[PDB]
Amino acid sequence: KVPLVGRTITHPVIGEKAAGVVMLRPASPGTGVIAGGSARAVLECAGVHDVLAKSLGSSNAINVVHATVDALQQLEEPEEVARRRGKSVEDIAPAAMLRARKEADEAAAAARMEE
RNA sequence: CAUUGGAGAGUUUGAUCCUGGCUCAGGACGAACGCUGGCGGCGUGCUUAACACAUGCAAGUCGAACGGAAAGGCCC
Ligand SMILES: [Mg+2]
Ligand SMILES: [Mg+2]
Ligand SMILES: [Mg+2]
């Protein structure tokens, strides 16, 4: 599973397997998947629609894919961050991020009911 | 107590991974060249020889400072 805060990455990450470093940052809605071919394919399959991904280190497709994979695995969903810190999401995480999560969920509700 | 923002590709090997250079996709210009060329709007136009320059023009004005009267102008 990949934690998406409304069609985008939860928080910036930097993953690296072997030598394939991949940097990921969340982006505002409508930004798209600004990523290289392999990392872009990984993100598009994961369902991220607004992300900025850069490929540092080697450009080998397999290693870049593994680096994108563990960069995504390093993602830490806000509820589990709160569980980690023994606090609440309203106490640990940015209000804008939480709000955007509510509007994403509600727009999701709209889509579901419309089905 | 969130962001307005980051894409790669080819090429060392029989094959692989890494390192690594080289090359390319983008944008730009006070540009030139080739082919081509309808119009309008707004800009811009010797980057080199601070090289040598024909010709015209680019700094005059004041008679309410002055003697005046060479012209035009009035009066004989
Ligand atoms: Mg390394
Ligand atoms: Mg060799
Ligand atoms: Mg070969």
mmCIF file of all heavy atoms in Angstrom, chain A residues 51-71:
data_model
loop_
_atom_site.group_PDB
_atom_site.id
_atom_site.type_symbol
_atom_site.label_atom_id
_atom_site.label_comp_id
_atom_site.label_asym_id
_atom_site.label_seq_id
_atom_site.Cartn_x
_atom_site.Cartn_y
_atom_site.Cartn_z
ATOM 1 N N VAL A 51 3.012 14.516 -8.457
ATOM 2 C CA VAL A 51 4.251 14.144 -7.790
ATOM 3 C C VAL A 51 5.411 14.676 -8.610
ATOM 4 O O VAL A 51 5.323 14.790 -9.837
ATOM 5 C CB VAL A 51 4.335 12.609 -7.599
ATOM 6 C CG1 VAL A 51 4.417 11.914 -8.940
ATOM 7 C CG2 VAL A 51 5.518 12.237 -6.731
ATOM 8 N N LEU A 52 6.497 15.024 -7.925
ATOM 9 C CA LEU A 52 7.737 15.467 -8.550
ATOM 10 C C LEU A 52 8.812 14.457 -8.184
ATOM 11 O O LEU A 52 9.183 14.344 -7.012
ATOM 12 C CB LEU A 52 8.116 16.863 -8.065
ATOM 13 C CG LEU A 52 7.650 18.089 -8.843
ATOM 14 C CD1 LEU A 52 6.186 17.996 -9.204
ATOM 15 C CD2 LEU A 52 7.894 19.311 -7.997
ATOM 16 N N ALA A 53 9.315 13.721 -9.171
ATOM 17 C CA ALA A 53 10.289 12.667 -8.936
ATOM 18 C C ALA A 53 11.530 12.917 -9.775
ATOM 19 O O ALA A 53 11.432 13.160 -10.980
ATOM 20 C CB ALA A 53 9.702 11.294 -9.259
ATOM 21 N N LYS A 54 12.687 12.855 -9.132
ATOM 22 C CA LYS A 54 13.970 13.019 -9.791
ATOM 23 C C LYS A 54 14.809 11.767 -9.591
ATOM 24 O O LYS A 54 14.744 11.121 -8.544
ATOM 25 C CB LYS A 54 14.725 14.236 -9.255
ATOM 26 C CG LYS A 54 15.887 14.672 -10.120
ATOM 27 C CD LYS A 54 15.409 15.105 -11.485
ATOM 28 C CE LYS A 54 16.532 15.704 -12.305
ATOM 29 N NZ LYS A 54 17.474 14.666 -12.786
ATOM 30 N N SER A 55 15.596 11.428 -10.601
ATOM 31 C CA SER A 55 16.428 10.231 -10.581
ATOM 32 C C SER A 55 17.885 10.654 -10.439
ATOM 33 O O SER A 55 18.513 11.091 -11.406
ATOM 34 C CB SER A 55 16.210 9.401 -11.840
ATOM 35 O OG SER A 55 17.131 8.329 -11.903
ATOM 36 N N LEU A 56 18.414 10.529 -9.229
ATOM 37 C CA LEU A 56 19.824 10.723 -8.945
ATOM 38 C C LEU A 56 20.531 9.371 -8.957
ATOM 39 O O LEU A 56 19.924 8.321 -8.727
ATOM 40 C CB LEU A 56 20.013 11.395 -7.584
ATOM 41 C CG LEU A 56 19.891 12.916 -7.459
ATOM 42 C CD1 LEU A 56 20.975 13.607 -8.268
ATOM 43 C CD2 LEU A 56 18.508 13.425 -7.825
ATOM 44 N N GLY A 57 21.833 9.404 -9.204
ATOM 45 C CA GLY A 57 22.577 8.163 -9.275
ATOM 46 C C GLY A 57 22.403 7.472 -10.617
ATOM 47 O O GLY A 57 22.130 8.104 -11.639
ATOM 48 N N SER A 58 22.564 6.153 -10.607
ATOM 49 C CA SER A 58 22.555 5.393 -11.848
ATOM 50 C C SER A 58 21.182 5.438 -12.505
ATOM 51 O O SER A 58 20.151 5.561 -11.843
ATOM 52 C CB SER A 58 22.961 3.945 -11.600
ATOM 53 O OG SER A 58 21.861 3.183 -11.140
ATOM 54 N N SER A 59 21.186 5.334 -13.831
ATOM 55 C CA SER A 59 19.978 5.412 -14.635
ATOM 56 C C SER A 59 19.483 4.047 -15.086
ATOM 57 O O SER A 59 18.585 3.974 -15.931
ATOM 58 C CB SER A 59 20.222 6.308 -15.847
ATOM 59 O OG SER A 59 21.308 5.823 -16.612
ATOM 60 N N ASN A 60 20.051 2.967 -14.559
ATOM 61 C CA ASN A 60 19.575 1.632 -14.892
ATOM 62 C C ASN A 60 18.123 1.474 -14.464
ATOM 63 O O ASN A 60 17.752 1.832 -13.344
ATOM 64 C CB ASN A 60 20.451 0.579 -14.218
ATOM 65 C CG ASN A 60 20.009 -0.830 -14.529
ATOM 66 O OD1 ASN A 60 19.139 -1.380 -13.857
ATOM 67 N ND2 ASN A 60 20.606 -1.426 -15.553
ATOM 68 N N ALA A 61 17.301 0.930 -15.365
ATOM 69 C CA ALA A 61 15.860 0.906 -15.140
ATOM 70 C C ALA A 61 15.493 0.086 -13.910
ATOM 71 O O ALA A 61 14.657 0.508 -13.104
ATOM 72 C CB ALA A 61 15.146 0.365 -16.378
ATOM 73 N N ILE A 62 16.110 -1.085 -13.742
ATOM 74 C CA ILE A 62 15.765 -1.956 -12.620
ATOM 75 C C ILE A 62 16.074 -1.265 -11.298
ATOM 76 O O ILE A 62 15.242 -1.226 -10.381
ATOM 77 C CB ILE A 62 16.507 -3.301 -12.735
ATOM 78 C CG1 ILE A 62 16.281 -3.937 -14.109
ATOM 79 C CG2 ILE A 62 16.058 -4.255 -11.639
ATOM 80 C CD1 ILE A 62 17.464 -3.837 -15.048
ATOM 81 N N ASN A 63 17.275 -0.694 -11.187
ATOM 82 C CA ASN A 63 17.687 -0.066 -9.938
ATOM 83 C C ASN A 63 16.877 1.194 -9.658
ATOM 84 O O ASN A 63 16.533 1.469 -8.503
ATOM 85 C CB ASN A 63 19.182 0.241 -9.986
ATOM 86 C CG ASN A 63 20.033 -1.010 -9.895
ATOM 87 O OD1 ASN A 63 20.820 -1.307 -10.792
ATOM 88 N ND2 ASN A 63 19.878 -1.754 -8.807
ATOM 89 N N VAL A 64 16.557 1.966 -10.697
ATOM 90 C CA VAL A 64 15.711 3.142 -10.507
ATOM 91 C C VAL A 64 14.324 2.724 -10.038
ATOM 92 O O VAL A 64 13.708 3.391 -9.198
ATOM 93 C CB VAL A 64 15.650 3.975 -11.799
ATOM 94 C CG1 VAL A 64 14.585 5.045 -11.690
ATOM 95 C CG2 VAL A 64 16.998 4.609 -12.075
ATOM 96 N N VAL A 65 13.817 1.606 -10.560
ATOM 97 C CA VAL A 65 12.513 1.113 -10.128
ATOM 98 C C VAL A 65 12.551 0.706 -8.659
ATOM 99 O O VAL A 65 11.647 1.038 -7.885
ATOM 100 C CB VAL A 65 12.058 -0.051 -11.025
ATOM 101 C CG1 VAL A 65 11.010 -0.865 -10.319
ATOM 102 C CG2 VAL A 65 11.517 0.480 -12.339
ATOM 103 N N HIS A 66 13.597 -0.018 -8.249
ATOM 104 C CA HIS A 66 13.702 -0.399 -6.840
ATOM 105 C C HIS A 66 13.845 0.820 -5.937
ATOM 106 O O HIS A 66 13.321 0.838 -4.815
ATOM 107 C CB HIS A 66 14.866 -1.366 -6.612
ATOM 108 C CG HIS A 66 14.702 -2.692 -7.286
ATOM 109 N ND1 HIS A 66 15.399 -3.035 -8.424
ATOM 110 C CD2 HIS A 66 13.889 -3.740 -7.015
ATOM 111 C CE1 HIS A 66 15.045 -4.248 -8.808
ATOM 112 N NE2 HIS A 66 14.130 -4.698 -7.969
ATOM 113 N N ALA A 67 14.567 1.841 -6.397
ATOM 114 C CA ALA A 67 14.706 3.056 -5.604
ATOM 115 C C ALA A 67 13.377 3.789 -5.476
ATOM 116 O O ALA A 67 13.042 4.289 -4.399
ATOM 117 C CB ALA A 67 15.765 3.960 -6.217
ATOM 118 N N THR A 68 12.603 3.866 -6.556
ATOM 119 C CA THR A 68 11.268 4.444 -6.438
ATOM 120 C C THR A 68 10.408 3.618 -5.492
ATOM 121 O O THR A 68 9.620 4.164 -4.710
ATOM 122 C CB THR A 68 10.611 4.547 -7.812
ATOM 123 O OG1 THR A 68 11.561 5.040 -8.762
ATOM 124 C CG2 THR A 68 9.430 5.498 -7.759
ATOM 125 N N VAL A 69 10.570 2.294 -5.533
ATOM 126 C CA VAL A 69 9.768 1.412 -4.692
ATOM 127 C C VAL A 69 10.055 1.668 -3.219
ATOM 128 O O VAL A 69 9.133 1.856 -2.419
ATOM 129 C CB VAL A 69 10.011 -0.059 -5.071
ATOM 130 C CG1 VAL A 69 9.620 -0.974 -3.923
ATOM 131 C CG2 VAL A 69 9.230 -0.415 -6.325
ATOM 132 N N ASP A 70 11.334 1.687 -2.828
ATOM 133 C CA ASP A 70 11.583 1.889 -1.403
ATOM 134 C C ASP A 70 11.394 3.342 -0.991
ATOM 135 O O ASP A 70 11.117 3.603 0.183
ATOM 136 C CB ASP A 70 12.973 1.407 -0.962
ATOM 137 C CG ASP A 70 14.105 2.205 -1.556
ATOM 138 O OD1 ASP A 70 13.861 3.108 -2.365
ATOM 139 O OD2 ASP A 70 15.261 1.953 -1.166
ATOM 140 N N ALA A 71 11.492 4.288 -1.929
ATOM 141 C CA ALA A 71 11.084 5.652 -1.621
ATOM 142 C C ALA A 71 9.608 5.704 -1.262
ATOM 143 O O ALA A 71 9.215 6.387 -0.311
ATOM 144 C CB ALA A 71 11.383 6.569 -2.805
#
